[PDB]
Design goal:
The chain has about 270 residues and is of the alpha+beta class. The protein has 2 domains: about 90 residues, Phosphorylase Kinase, domain 1 (2-Layer Sandwich), CATH 3.30.200; about 180 residues, Transferase(Phosphotransferase) domain 1 (Transferase(Phosphotransferase), domain 1), CATH 1.10.510. About 40% of the residues lie in helices and about 15% in strands. It has a 5-stranded antiparallel β-sheet. β1 and β2 form a beta hairpin. α3 packs antiparallel against α7, α3 packs antiparallel against α10 and α7 packs antiparallel against α9. It is globular and about 55 Å long. The protein starts with 11 loop residues before the first strand and ends with a helix. The structure holds the ligand Cc1cc(Nc2nn(C(C)C)c(=O)c3cc(N4CCN(C)CC4)ccc23)n[nH]1. The site of the ligand Cc1cc(Nc2nn(C(C)C)c(=O)c3cc(N4CCN(C)CC4)ccc23)n[nH]1 has 16 residues, from β1, β5 and β6. It is found in: Cytoplasm; Cell membrane; Nucleus; Membrane raft. This is Tyrosine-protein kinase BTK.
């Protein structure tokens, strides 16, 4: 079985429906009567057994404070449950678009820092995310941003690349070598991170806000990039822009990006 990862359904309680997507309903509940959890009730026939086993392995091997944590699964009942850590402020993209937060740039840089820490860990484990974007990060009650949409959490979040069976490609988060040749690498994650920084500093604007995906691909083919968001200092823009070098091998690592971000944070 799944050992300690197999959660006893008797230890779950339900409080509120958070969402309903392609792979089923997500509810906010408690585990053991004390721990806040997001509970995904998997729609029967939305994923195969092998897919589940593969994606479970992914989440069970990876663990970091800035990665949305799997708590467990219930697999002896129908429907299947996936139990994850609860993130009270939900999706980062919607969070950024709420104008009432009136974010300081210090807050925005800390969001970047949180994600960069998670990505550095993934980098260290040789794990490629492949769909890093604000829509795929979650925010907890404390304003801490964490990366999700990996392994089983792809199904929890009703990932549109997964639910569209590859139809909806993240063009606006992709480097030229991906758009041209499907050449995925750590450096395609690095590129995505830069675009994410841009999303954060643009308070959740769609990247290439006046372009189609097709115009976007042409724009980057001309060596052109996203402008500096007004809220981003020149130093911050230098960091995000470094992620978009034409040559993949000229792009920084997440280790370097984290050091750059911290240096700017301490400089304020
Ligand atoms: C996996 C996981 C998901 C999760 N929490 C939430 N997930 N989702 C979907 C991604 C399922 C929401 O849509 C959502 C929305 C909110 N509202 C949104 C409205 N805002 C004003 C208050 C917070 C909170 C939490 C969530 N924690 N862990």
């Amino acid at each position: 079985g799944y050992g300690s990862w197999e959660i006893d359904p008797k230890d779950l309680t339900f409080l509120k429906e958070l969402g309903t997507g392609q792979f089923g309903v997500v509810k906010y509940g408690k585990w053991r009567g004390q721990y806040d959890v997001a509970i995904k009730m998997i729609k029967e026939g939305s994923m195969s057994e092998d897919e589940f086993i593969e994606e479970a392995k992914v989440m069970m091997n990876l663990s970091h404070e800035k990665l949305v944590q799997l708590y467990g699964v219930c697999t002896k009942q129908r429907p299947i449950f996936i139990i994850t850590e609860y993130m009270a402020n939900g999706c980062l993209l919607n969070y950024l678009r709420e104008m009432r937060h009136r974010f300081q740039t210090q807050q925005l840089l800390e969001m970047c820092k949180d994600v960069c820490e998670a990505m550095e860990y993934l980098e260290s484990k040789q794990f490629l995310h492949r769909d890093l974007a604000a829509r795929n990060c979650l925010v907890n009650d404390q304003g801490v941003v964490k990366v999700s949409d990996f392994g089983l959490s792809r199904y929890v979040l009703d990932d549109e690349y997964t639910s569209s069976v590859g139809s909806k490609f993240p063009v606006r988060w992709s480097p030229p070598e991906v758009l041209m040749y499907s050449k995925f690498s750590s450096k395609s994650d690095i590129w995505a991170f830069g675009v994410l920084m841009w999303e954060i500093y643009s308070l959740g604007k769609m990247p290439y806000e006046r372009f189609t995906n097709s115009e976007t691909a042409e724009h980057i083919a001309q060596g052109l990039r996203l402008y500096r968001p007004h809220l981003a200092s020149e130093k911050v823009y230098t960091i995000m822009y470094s992620c978009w070098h034409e040559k993949a091998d000229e792009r920084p690592t997440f280790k370097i990006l984290l050091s750059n971000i911290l240096d700017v944070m301490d400089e304020e």
